[PDB]
């Protein structure tokens, strides 16, 4: 028996009122599916939201433990297992996800196999085990039949684009998605709606449409209880203010950091952007990671040195970064720092070009401001933002 079923019986023998609470929470018409779920092994709810809503409402502190055990007992050929994979992937519960993937790829249900293979492409691409050309080839090799994995195959490319500073394709890929084509799985369609809200938030951030960025993050926040989506919504709102309002930027990052608490991966996004925010506004930084050999961390060490007038040491560290593999957006930042250190218009022009190439309309303001101060034609600088 799965741990969730044991706990619910324990709690229900003390309190028969819990049946109606769980029925309502689970979106059931009557208690009968819940009776069946408690008493007969392998009975799944029609919608996976039923079990998640119960676990979150009744056992908020034990969600991971109970859902891990529940998911890894599911028949992997079922709708329930396919929903559980989306749950696991959405939450970045990698140990649940990878175990589901591995057993779904091997099973005889063609849908479950398709879901397993496509989520696996996402996992491989995000870890750097494959590149984007291999990912695309693997999507083509899969001969995808479901509307949902057709959509997910677009989303996984969008996630990679965002992570690799290659923003131009994201709005194009977005136009290929139609969520109304997902018919059978309301749990998953709903999860995908939240995914799309957070993706759209980032798309508008990168287009310098800050009001729409904030609107879509707020939409995600209003309709989710998944830590991952809350974290990224507050992160993206914080970034929307990074050039315009120190206090609101910081506030949103501190909120998000509190939502991230106890997940180091999530916490790191906030520490990184707080590092950048404090450096950009010339404040004493408490957030920098001096031990990391990630280029973005090393960039913040350098920016701090620039604020501390240690230009010679900043330049020596920046030269070490020229040896490193960087994406186009990262190179925007690189050349902006180089410009601040050397006072060469050349470096600011390169910074502009890299931000154009990554289709970053937010960050491009940084080198543009410096070029304006160095006597470049303001009208031309304005035209570059169009």
């Amino acid at each position: 028996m799965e741990l969730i079923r044991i706990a619910m019986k324990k709690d229900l023998e003390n309190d028969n009122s819990l049946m109606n609470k769980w029925a309502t929470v689970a979106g059931l018409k009557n208690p009968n599916p819940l009776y069946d779920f408690l008493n007969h092994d392998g009975k799944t709810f029609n919608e996976f939201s039923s079990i998640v809503n119960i676990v979150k409402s009744q056992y908020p502190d034990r969600e991971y433990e109970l859902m891990k055990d529940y998911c890894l007992n599911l028949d992997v050929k079922t709708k329930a297992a396919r929903s559980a994979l989306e749950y696991a992937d959405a939450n970045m519960f990698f140990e649940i996800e990878d175990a589901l993937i591995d057993s779904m790829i091997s099973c005889s249900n063609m849908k479950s196999k398709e879901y397993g293979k496509v989520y696996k492409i996402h996992r491989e691409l995000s870890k750097g085990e494959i590149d984007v050309f291999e990912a695309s080839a693997n999507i083509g090799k899969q001969r995808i039949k479901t509307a949902e994995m057709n959509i997910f195959s677009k989303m996984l490319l969008m996630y990679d684009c965002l992570n690799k500073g290659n923003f131009a394709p994201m709005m194009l890929l977005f136009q290929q998605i139609d969520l109304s084509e997902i018919k059978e799985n309301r749990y998953l369609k709903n999860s995908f709606e939240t995914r799309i809200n957070v993706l759209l938030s980032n798309i508008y951030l990168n287009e310098n449409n800050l009001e729409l960025c904030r609107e879509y993050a707020q939409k995600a926040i209003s309709s989710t209880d998944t830590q991952r989506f809350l974290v990224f919504s507050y992160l993206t709102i914080g970034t929307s203010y990074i050039f315009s309002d120190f206090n609101l930027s910081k506030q949103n990052y501190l909120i998000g950091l509190k939502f991230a608490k106890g997940n180091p991966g999530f916490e790191e996004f906030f520490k990184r952007n707080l590092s950048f925010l404090n450096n950009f506004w010339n404040k004493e930084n408490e957030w920098i990671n001096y031990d990391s050999d990630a280029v973005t961390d090393m960039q913040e060490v350098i920016f701090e040195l620039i604020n501390h007038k240690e230009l010679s040491k900043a330049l020596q560290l920046l030269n070490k970064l020229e040896e490193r593999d960087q994406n186009e957006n990262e190179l925007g930042f690189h050349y902006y720092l180089k410009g601040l250190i050397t006072n060469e218009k050349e470096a600011f022009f390169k910074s502009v070009e890299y931000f154009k190439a990554s289709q970053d309309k937010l960050s491009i303001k940084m080198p543009l401001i410096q070029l304006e101060k160095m006597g470049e034609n303001p009208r031309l600088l304005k035209i570059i933002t169009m």
């Binding site: 969008m158 965002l162 992570n163 980032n202 990224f232 992160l235 990262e330 960050s363």
Partner: peptide
């Protein structure tokens, strides 16, 4: 630099 996620 700035990091992003969804």
């Amino acid at each position: 630099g700035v990091v992003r996620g969804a």
